[PDB]
């Protein structure tokens, strides 16, 4: 025994709600934050044995990292994401209009609410101001709500080195070149037949399996719950397909209560 043929962290860690949770970046190019905070929340939980469980705000990494992480809603770097984690912290924050934690995500999808639907979902508009103020009623104040990381490393371009990391430590962030047919994806082990390059995109790899004889990574997107399989998808594994094995990064949380 070293390593299973099928793995899924959701069902390996039942008592950690977040690992099942699919956030939604709205119209910003911020998945770079989303992939980090999502694994981070998962890791925090896993590395306390579900004794601490928290939705880490992406609004936080999104709004207060400035240029050291990139450009906000105009795009960013996962690895910079994680040491911003380690060196400042990141607060609790949840979904658009959830009123969970300190900074809820402040950008929406586009259907449901109209009153001050506030910054709408226009072209390449600005990122939100870095606010550093907790939502009214949310209790522990801004700087005491911060969770820190220990470090941030990259995983090497290895398949075996990623399955190791995920199984010992929980989900990671990574990224891959998105091409046209990707959005067209509805189920299966994605593989690019066509389309031009769309850009790179950050994601969260939680698991792996073989289906129809095709080996694959289980990835979670940040495009809501009605994309793909309930927000989730699969991508061919073992071939560095679209860079999916190339750029993987993770941390270990600073657990000092």
């Amino acid at each position: 025994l070293k390593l299973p043929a099928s793995f899924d962290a959701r069902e390996q860690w039942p008592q950690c709600p977040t690992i099942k949770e699919i956030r939604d970046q709205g119209s910003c190019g911020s998945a770079w934050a989303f992939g980090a905070v999502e694994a981070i929340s998962d890791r925090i939980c896993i590395h306390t044995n579900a004794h601490v469980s928290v939705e880490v705000s992406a609004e936080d990494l999104l709004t207060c990292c400035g240029s050291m992480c990139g450009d906000g809603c105009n795009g960013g770097y996962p690895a910079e994401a994680w040491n911003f984690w380690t060196r400042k912290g990141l607060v609790s924050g949840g979904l658009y209009e959830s009123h969970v934690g300190c900074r809820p995500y402040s950008i929406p999808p586009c259907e449901a609410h109209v009153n001050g639907a506030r910054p709408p979902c226009t072209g390449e508009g600005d990122t939100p101001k870095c606010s550093k103020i907790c939502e009214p009623g949310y209790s522990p104040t801004y700087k005491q709500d911060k969770h820190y990381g220990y470090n941030s490393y990259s995983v090497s371009n290895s398949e075996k080195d990623i399955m190791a990391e995920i199984y010992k430590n929980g989900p990671v962030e990574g990224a891959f070149s998105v091409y046209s047919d990707f959005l067209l994806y509805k189920s299966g082990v994605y593989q690019h037949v066509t389309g031009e390059m769309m850009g790179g995109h950050a994601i969260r790899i939680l698991g792996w399996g073989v289906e129809n004889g095709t080996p694959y990574w289980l990835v979670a997107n940040s495009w809501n719950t009605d994309w793909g399989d309930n927000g989730f998808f699969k991508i061919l594994r073992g071939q560095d397909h679209c860079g999916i094995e190339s750029e993987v990064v993770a941390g270990i949380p600073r657990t000092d209560q």
Partner: protein, 110 residues
């Protein structure tokens, strides 16, 4: 000639002839799952008989993941009269709303 339309001209009436090209170019960040589309979430023209349409994406010059670029719709008008191009910046499997950024232009032949 090529007629060049952008976000500043949402809801204009551009005069054109049969077969001149119209670059309609607007910001689009596909990494968010939002592209620009005719009704129904397709990039094809609703009426291939009134006008014919192609589009392309142009990523940005950056390594930032989640950097956004520019979509072009190369609309050629194939028939006389007036033509609403109605695009909507949305997520196809999810569909438009009151809150979706919208773009239109009116193409007038002859």
């Amino acid at each position: 000639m090529s007629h060049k339309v952008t976000k500043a001209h949402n809801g204009a009436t551009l005069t054109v002839a049969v077969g001149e090209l119209v670059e309609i170019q607007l910001p689009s960040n596909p990494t968010t799952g939002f592209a620009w589309y005719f009704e129904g979430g397709t990039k094809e023209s609703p009426n291939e008989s009134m006008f014919t349409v192609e589009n392309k994406y142009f990523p940005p010059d950056s390594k930032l993941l989640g950097a956004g670029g520019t979509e072009h719709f190369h609309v050629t008008v194939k028939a006389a009269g007036t033509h609403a191009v109605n695009l909507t910046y949305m997520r196809p499997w999810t569909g438009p709303s009151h809150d979706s950024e919208r773009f239109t232009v009116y193409l007038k032949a002859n």
